[PDB]
Design a protein around this ligand. Sequence first.
Ligand SMILES: [Mg+2]
Length: 476
Amino acid sequence: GLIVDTRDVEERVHVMRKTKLAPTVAHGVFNPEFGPAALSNKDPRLNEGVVLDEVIFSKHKGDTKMSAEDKALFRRCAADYASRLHSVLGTANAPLSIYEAIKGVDGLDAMEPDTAPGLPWALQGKRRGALIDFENGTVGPEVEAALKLMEKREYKFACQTFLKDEIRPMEKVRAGKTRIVDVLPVEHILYTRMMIGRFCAQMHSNNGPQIGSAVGCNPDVDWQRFGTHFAQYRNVWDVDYSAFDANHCSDAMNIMFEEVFRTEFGFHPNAEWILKTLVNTEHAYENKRITVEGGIPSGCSATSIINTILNNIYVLYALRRHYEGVELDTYTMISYGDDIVVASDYDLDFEALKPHFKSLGQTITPADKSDKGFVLGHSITDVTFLKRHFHMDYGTGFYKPVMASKTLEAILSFARRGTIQEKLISVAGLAVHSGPDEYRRLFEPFQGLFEIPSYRSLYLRWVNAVCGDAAALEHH
RNA sequence: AUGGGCC
RNA sequence: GGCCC
Ligand SMILES: [Mg+2]
């Protein structure tokens, strides 16, 4: 986005500056080029001279202003994608009740009871549990009043800035490229779920290529559905973005909210408003109040869906800005936020699409960096989606999500105190697709120390998950 | 150390 | 409690 105002109000938003992540027994064995991101300016691992809280916001390098002609085309692509989207999902997008927003509904998980509260509830020493009854699904006086303000459309707020405590490639930890988390007031997240909760639940249920969204999918069982789909096309592209979230221009966001969340589609008038509040935001980091125009907050209730929707429109826009007579059936794509996989039978020139994505403020580059640019002829087994490859399982013939051995090694190298055992079992679900030999090697360091699931058991669990009949017929 | 997803 | 974005 574009930093338009930097202030120094006399109230610290003390940030958390000590990692919960610690090396495991595997760290000594795998020696990964990874490590927990820097949370403090006084981190010895940082490069001398690097000011953490200057690199954090360095991602905001402006807010691209689209011309009248470009804006007209974008609206035309937004409406077209919306048409497809609401054609599959339906028009049942009525506001969720205060109760359903908290407890959640079929296709939508419940709100986190004990996580960050936001402002100014943090400055007043209050957790979420004090403002909202997460059991019965009722709200306190504070939220109550705020919700009314949002109905009147007069509600203002500030985004709390959090240092994302996670494992990152050493080079970026040493550069100070710590990702940031935009914590929004709990009432804002609640109301957003009230406005578009029904819709989000529908997208999750109807995930797939036809709506261009993988949000809500289960890689275990859906890699077969996505795999056989893309394997039918001549060309498959693995496109990457740089600062996808931050580079959403205000023009694009506004038009997207206006075209997708119209009342005629079964939405509440305030569905469009609440989303537009994400466009112009004020961020509170310690003593500095930074006003940002453009970009998308990280802590939004539907950040992933918003990013995915945009991603779909961007592609349609870029293709229509370069070629003539481009429609939604000219290509196919699956998206999860900034993660994207495109496919088509036409020999599209993605390298030529570069300047067209720039008109949106986005910068595109080919995933694999062996080729100096986008190339044709790639298939589904060449690309990567959700940090997973598309590999064929010889025993079943189905596609299986396989993560790189380095990634898994990095994942198993670090863990937060007292959760090692529960993580191992979770990672085993990811590793199992790397084969018996690789699975065995990765968990070697943990043998005797923790319970490790047998490759056999997790393989059998998978076969039934992806196709029960196949597991049933296997007992002919 | 957060939003949504999935086990 | 983990992973993904
Ligand atoms: Mg990719």
